[PDB]
Design a protein around this ligand. Structure first.
Ligand SMILES: [Mg+2]
Ligand SMILES: [Mg+2]
Ligand SMILES: [Mg+2]
Ligand SMILES: [Mg+2]
Ligand SMILES: [Mg+2]
Ligand SMILES: [Mg+2]
Ligand SMILES: [Mg+2]
Ligand SMILES: [Mg+2]
Ligand SMILES: [Mg+2]
Ligand SMILES: [Mg+2]
Ligand SMILES: [Mg+2]
Ligand SMILES: [Mg+2]
Ligand SMILES: [Mg+2]
Ligand SMILES: [Mg+2]
Ligand SMILES: [Mg+2]
Ligand SMILES: [Mg+2]
Ligand SMILES: [Mg+2]
Ligand SMILES: [Mg+2]
Ligand SMILES: [Mg+2]
Ligand SMILES: [Mg+2]
Ligand SMILES: [Mg+2]
Ligand SMILES: [Mg+2]
Ligand SMILES: [Mg+2]
Ligand SMILES: [Mg+2]
Ligand SMILES: [Mg+2]
Ligand SMILES: [Mg+2]
Ligand SMILES: [Mg+2]
Ligand SMILES: [Mg+2]
Ligand SMILES: [Mg+2]
Ligand SMILES: [Mg+2]
Ligand SMILES: [Mg+2]
Ligand SMILES: [Mg+2]
Ligand SMILES: [Mg+2]
Ligand SMILES: [Mg+2]
Ligand SMILES: [Mg+2]
Ligand SMILES: [Mg+2]
Ligand SMILES: [Mg+2]
Ligand SMILES: [Mg+2]
Ligand SMILES: [Mg+2]
Ligand SMILES: [Mg+2]
Ligand SMILES: [Mg+2]
Ligand SMILES: [Mg+2]
Ligand SMILES: [Mg+2]
Ligand SMILES: [Mg+2]
Ligand SMILES: [Mg+2]
Ligand SMILES: [Mg+2]
Ligand SMILES: [Mg+2]
Ligand SMILES: [Mg+2]
Ligand SMILES: [Mg+2]
Ligand SMILES: [Mg+2]
Ligand SMILES: [Mg+2]
Ligand SMILES: [Mg+2]
Ligand SMILES: [Mg+2]
Ligand SMILES: [Mg+2]
Ligand SMILES: [Mg+2]
Ligand SMILES: [Mg+2]
Ligand SMILES: [Mg+2]
Ligand SMILES: [Mg+2]
Ligand SMILES: [Mg+2]
Ligand SMILES: [Mg+2]
Ligand SMILES: [Mg+2]
Ligand SMILES: [Mg+2]
Ligand SMILES: [Mg+2]
Ligand SMILES: [Mg+2]
Ligand SMILES: [Mg+2]
Ligand SMILES: [Mg+2]
Ligand SMILES: [Mg+2]
Ligand SMILES: [Mg+2]
Ligand SMILES: [Mg+2]
Ligand SMILES: [Mg+2]
Ligand SMILES: [Mg+2]
Ligand SMILES: [Mg+2]
Ligand SMILES: [Mg+2]
Ligand SMILES: [Mg+2]
Ligand SMILES: [Mg+2]
Ligand SMILES: [Mg+2]
Ligand SMILES: [Mg+2]
Ligand SMILES: [Mg+2]
Ligand SMILES: [Mg+2]
Ligand SMILES: [Mg+2]
Ligand SMILES: [Mg+2]
Ligand SMILES: [Mg+2]
Ligand SMILES: [Mg+2]
Ligand SMILES: [Mg+2]
Ligand SMILES: [Mg+2]
Ligand SMILES: [Mg+2]
Ligand SMILES: [Mg+2]
Ligand SMILES: [Mg+2]
Ligand SMILES: [Mg+2]
Lengths: 63, 112, 77, 50, 252
RNA sequence: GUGCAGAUCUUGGUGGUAGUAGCAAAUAUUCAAAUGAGAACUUUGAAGACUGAAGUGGGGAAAGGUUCCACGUCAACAGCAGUUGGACGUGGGUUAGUCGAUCCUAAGAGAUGGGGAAGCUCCGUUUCAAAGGCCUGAUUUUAUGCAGGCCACCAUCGAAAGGGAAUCCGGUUAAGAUUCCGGAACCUGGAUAUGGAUUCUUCACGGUAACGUAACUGAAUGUGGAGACGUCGGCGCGAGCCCUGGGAGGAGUUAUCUUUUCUUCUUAACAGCUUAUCACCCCGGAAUUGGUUUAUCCGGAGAUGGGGUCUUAUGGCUGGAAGAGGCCAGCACCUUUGCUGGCUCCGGUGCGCUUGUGACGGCCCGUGAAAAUCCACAGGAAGGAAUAGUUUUCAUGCCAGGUCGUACUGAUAACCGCAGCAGGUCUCCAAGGUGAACAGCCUCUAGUUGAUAGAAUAAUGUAGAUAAGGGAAGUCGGCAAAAUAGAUCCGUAACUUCGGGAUAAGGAUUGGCUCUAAGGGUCGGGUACGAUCAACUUAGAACUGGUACGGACAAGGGGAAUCUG
């Protein structure tokens, strides 16, 4: 029951928090997820040819 | 929640005491001891793991057939191909220049 | 320790030397999706190894069963 | 201990044997003097020093 | 009183060298037929870190002239030698960094390391990281050679005495601060048990000439004579001068 | 060896003290039955609690030595008791080719030719020494002399946590089990015969190559490899655990409510096929530089791309193997105890937890053992076929595997502390919630419920709390105590070696409930989007309450200076 309300975004207020924002969800974890998703899009846009390898390479390093 | 015990007198976490957990047909959890992992044999020239060769702990190499211990080229279970490639070319060219070296100083003696 | 799919190779084993006993196991199993069928495993006890041939076809089974050497000791189920 | 030398296991055995009460028929012998076993030993009172 | 600290070291109990990881003694090849008449060729098969040493060893393999087999030597590596390089050792041998030649066979100004004291001893002088000796002259009659060692001293030895061209590798090690107790700790951990050092002046009299007093202090001149006896020698032994050295060093 | 009142005299015995100090740490007990002369204390049933997987759980190492188990049993012992016991009496109990020792080497120890020393002995360990033994040939008096060629390695002891040939699952005892029983394997040594392979081109073919294989002769000598190795970091993957959907069973609750809460649904070594990051090969020849990791490293010394090769950690399917084990129903009956059935199925998820492992990266004046042992290659000594030879590194088959330890405790009672002492004493396995968490607090499994008891609640205490107004006036001294504290946001001085000082200081906010928004995966697209499934994070907004909300637990007082390292 409780686990459900947490899925509903409950008991999450500032008074319910003891560990730091980092300890709860590390920044690096967040970043690694993101940079991999970006990395993963570029690759399929190139493979499909939606983007050309030159534009890809630029976006790669900008990502 | 089901916990487990070593199967031998040795209480400590030494590398010979490595353990694994396993579900049995009895339906229960039990430890089973685990031999140390074997490592790949290495080229003597360079030191890469030489391909084609099976990897076992040293005395198990006696329990296996010779095809697992070699590859079909010369220096098979010993050197790494590309290394053998080199000592062919090197041998040849040196044995050649060795002729070039003699006849040149054969003339040098004769004209001087 | 070993399994056999060659019905010819099998018979050869049964007539070899060291092989005295043997056993035939019968299993109810299901086919594909819907229905059942009758599986039979022929287990031959060799000196260092137990060979077992699985005949999925009920017909080949009955045929194979009689093919067994008459001097061989066989355990039913 | 708990994995022993045979030597120790042997002494341990002789020790076990010596641990019994005085056989009572001795008490009946002519000129008997021994009343009780005076060398009796117990594992929680005296340790046997190997 | 007690036997002081510098007396207890000679009995070699806890003071022996910590030797377990060492590659084995560094030496020149035995001085044999090949080396004193011709030259002989080798390959450096490796250059490697020795424990408790400043400078890397070089494993150098040669052929055994009298038997079919390989024979491997341990050299102190001169700066610039490299794996796969060919090493030449003998009376007649070209003058190149890494080779080993008799001191007689090299011109003045030549720079060599691991040089023998007597010929054959497989090297004595100038083995520490950064060090070398310079050949400052020859006396062909009685075939001696005059060299200058790292200390500044100038010694004269047999021209047959072998040395190896170049300087020893890993130099400049001592320019970097140790920065903390631990770095020193791990340093002497692989040498011997000399660290840390209690000052005698922090001890009681039983322990040391310097021991005792209601203030820390030596109490008599800390310059001790050679004539002094064991248990007496601590502080500055046989000092011909003492005090901050002013002005240029560097013997004339 | 002759006379005691003394010597803090010697040994032994005995008093007053005194039925006195006391038997108060470790939360905690209770009802009934049974047994028995006897029950606060034994056994059983019930109830109340506890340890809370960093255990009061399940095992071991040292050490102990029978304490293990059964039966009998209370004189002493367990600072109350006793019918109970680690006590007393009497018996029973420890099963191995595979688990250890055994073998190897580590620091080290220590014989020997010797050299010291009056000598007990000291030094040396390959050291100034004539230091030893293998492979087969020579024998057809015959049994093992000599003929070669090697090897000059020169004792030995030293690890029940280092190195190391080989075993698993189920069942079983009062007490033993990787040791017994059942089944199924594997290693080593010794013997060997049949099958297959090989050969008239004698000592195998195939692939451009990486390399493939059921095999595919190989002495001396030599060389390579394995054994064989630091630490920390993030990232990838495996296993077990954790969470969870459908179904098939059994159990609990049901005044009311819950298609509900709890639980069973398992698969060993070993074998076959198959499975890999890395590495490598072939084709190709690159600026408009490309590829690419979370982490910037790679390419004309050949990148990107396309195609292949290899290790088999590891996983998958099958054999082992459902016949086992788990969970149910339906009959039988003083028994030994059966009998008959059914079902044991298909999925999901991840910055989860523990552990294993890979490819990388950080560090060093630290760069993180040895030997036994096993294999390989270079070499080509030699031995070998057509009327039949070579092969036991391919398959199958035969025999054997000794000696010693193996019980149990491992600690608030089996060890050491004079003891059933609040001390000490090496280590493996580790569930759910809350939460950053192996924290505290509550729980499941398992184990406990042991520590004299009854009645009262004076003084004085020990240990735990609170106090109006004042606020260090107390004291040598703020000693003791109190105050503070998590997290998000705001804000932060002198000075400084520029790294700090800093959580400086100083502030606001925090429940419940109900919504909104942002953040991802996967598949088909000719040479813009659609469809589906699975996750708590962060911010914003309403409503609501005796203004409460890190509601217990958990959790820094701060500032200005002097002396000093
Ligand atoms: Mg970061
Ligand atoms: Mg992705
Ligand atoms: Mg880039
Ligand atoms: Mg055990
Ligand atoms: Mg470790
Ligand atoms: Mg292979
Ligand atoms: Mg191969
Ligand atoms: Mg060949
Ligand atoms: Mg005692
Ligand atoms: Mg004694
Ligand atoms: Mg030494
Ligand atoms: Mg020290
Ligand atoms: Mg000093
Ligand atoms: Mg000092
Ligand atoms: Mg002092
Ligand atoms: Mg003195
Ligand atoms: Mg003096
Ligand atoms: Mg003094
Ligand atoms: Mg002073
Ligand atoms: Mg008398
Ligand atoms: Mg007298
Ligand atoms: Mg008198
Ligand atoms: Mg008297
Ligand atoms: Mg008196
Ligand atoms: Mg008197
Ligand atoms: Mg008296
Ligand atoms: Mg009384
Ligand atoms: Mg009293
Ligand atoms: Mg008391
Ligand atoms: Mg009680
Ligand atoms: Mg009870
Ligand atoms: Mg509790
Ligand atoms: Mg805890
Ligand atoms: Mg035990
Ligand atoms: Mg009694
Ligand atoms: Mg007792
Ligand atoms: Mg009592
Ligand atoms: Mg009593
Ligand atoms: Mg007894
Ligand atoms: Mg007994
Ligand atoms: Mg073993
Ligand atoms: Mg033995
Ligand atoms: Mg000696
Ligand atoms: Mg030994
Ligand atoms: Mg051992
Ligand atoms: Mg071991
Ligand atoms: Mg069992
Ligand atoms: Mg039994
Ligand atoms: Mg037991
Ligand atoms: Mg058996
Ligand atoms: Mg069998
Ligand atoms: Mg064999
Ligand atoms: Mg073939
Ligand atoms: Mg070797
Ligand atoms: Mg090696
Ligand atoms: Mg090791
Ligand atoms: Mg196994
Ligand atoms: Mg590819
Ligand atoms: Mg190809
Ligand atoms: Mg493959
Ligand atoms: Mg991640
Ligand atoms: Mg390294
Ligand atoms: Mg090998
Ligand atoms: Mg074989
Ligand atoms: Mg024997
Ligand atoms: Mg046991
Ligand atoms: Mg106990
Ligand atoms: Mg004791
Ligand atoms: Mg105790
Ligand atoms: Mg569960
Ligand atoms: Mg008590
Ligand atoms: Mg109490
Ligand atoms: Mg009381
Ligand atoms: Mg009071
Ligand atoms: Mg109050
Ligand atoms: Mg007040
Ligand atoms: Mg105030
Ligand atoms: Mg004031
Ligand atoms: Mg006052
Ligand atoms: Mg005052
Ligand atoms: Mg004061
Ligand atoms: Mg104050
Ligand atoms: Mg205080
Ligand atoms: Mg208050
Ligand atoms: Mg401050
Ligand atoms: Mg709010
Ligand atoms: Mg969304
Ligand atoms: Mg002052
Ligand atoms: Mg200080």
């Amino acid at each position: 029951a409780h686990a459900q309300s947490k899925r509903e975004g409950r008991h999450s207020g500032y008074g319910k928090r003891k560990g730091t924002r980092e300890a709860r969800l590390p920044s690096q974890v967040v970043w690694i997820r993101r940079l991999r998703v970006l990395r993963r899009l570029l690759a399929k846009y190139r493979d499909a040819g939606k983007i050309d390898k030159h534009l890809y390479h630029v976006l790669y390093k900008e990502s | 929640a089901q916990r487990v015990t070593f199967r031998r007198r040795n209480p400590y976490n030494t590398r010979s005491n490595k353990i694994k957990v396993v579900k049995t047909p009895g339906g229960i959890l039990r430890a089973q001891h685990v031999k140390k992992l074997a490592t790949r044999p290495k080229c003597g020239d360079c030191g890469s793991a030489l391909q084609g060769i099976s990897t076992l702990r040293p005395r198990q190499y006696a329990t296996v057939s010779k095809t697992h211990k070699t590859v079909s080229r010369a220096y098979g279970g010993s050197r790494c191909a590309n290394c053998v490639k080199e000592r062919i070319i090197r041998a040849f060219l040196i044995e050649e220049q060795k002729i070039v070296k003699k006849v040149v100083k054969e003339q040098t003696e004769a004209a001087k | 320790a070993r399994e056999i799919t060659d019905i010819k190779q099998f018979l050869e084993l049964t007539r070899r030397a060291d092989v005295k006993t043997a056993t035939v196991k019968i299993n109810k199993k299901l086919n594909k999706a819907g229905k059942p069928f009758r599986q039979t495993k022929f287990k031959v006890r060799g000196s260092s190894s137990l060979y077992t041939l699985v005949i999925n076809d009920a017909g080949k089974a009955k045929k194979l069963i009689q093919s067994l050497p008459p001097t061989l000791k066989v355990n039913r189920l | 201990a708990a994995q022993k030398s045979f030597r120790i296991k042997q002494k341990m055995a002789k020790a076990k044997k010596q641990n019994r009460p005085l056989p009572q028929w001795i008490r009946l012998r002519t000129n008997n003097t021994i009343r009780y076993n005076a060398k009796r030993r117990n594992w929680r009172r005296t340790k046997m020093n190997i | 009183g007690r036997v002081i600290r510098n007396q207890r070291k000679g009995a070699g109990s806890i003071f022996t060298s910590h030797t377990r990881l060492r590659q084995g003694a560094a030496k020149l090849r035995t001085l044999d037929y090949a080396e004193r008449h011709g030259y002989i060729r080798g390959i450096v098969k490796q250059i490697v870190h020795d424990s408790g040493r400043g400078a890397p060893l070089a494993k150098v393999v040669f052929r055994d002239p009298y038997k079919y087999r390989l024979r491997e030597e341990i050299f102190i590596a001169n700066e610039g030698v490299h794996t796969g390089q060919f090493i030449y050792a003998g009376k007649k041998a070209s003058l190149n960094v890494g080779n080993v030649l008799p001191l007689g066979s090299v011109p003045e100004g030549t720079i060599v390391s691991n040089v023998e004291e007597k010929p054959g001893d497989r090297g004595a002088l100038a083995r520490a990281s950064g060090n070398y000796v310079i050949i400052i002259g020859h006396n062909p009659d009685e075939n001696k050679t005059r060299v200058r060692l790292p200390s500044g001293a100038k010694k004269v030895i047999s021209s047959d005495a072998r040395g190896v061209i170049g300087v020893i590798a890993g130099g400049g090690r001592v320019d970097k601060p140790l920065l903390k107790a631990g770095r020193a700790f791990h340093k002497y951990r692989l040498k011997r048990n000399s660290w840390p050092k209690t000052r005698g002046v922090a001890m009681n009299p039983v322990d040391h000439p310097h021991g005792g007093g209601n203030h820390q202090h030596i109490g008599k001149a800390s310059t001790i004579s050679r004539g002094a006896v064991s248990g007496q020698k601590a502080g500055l032994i046989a000092a011909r001068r003492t005090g901050l050295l002013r002005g240029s060093q560097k013997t004339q």
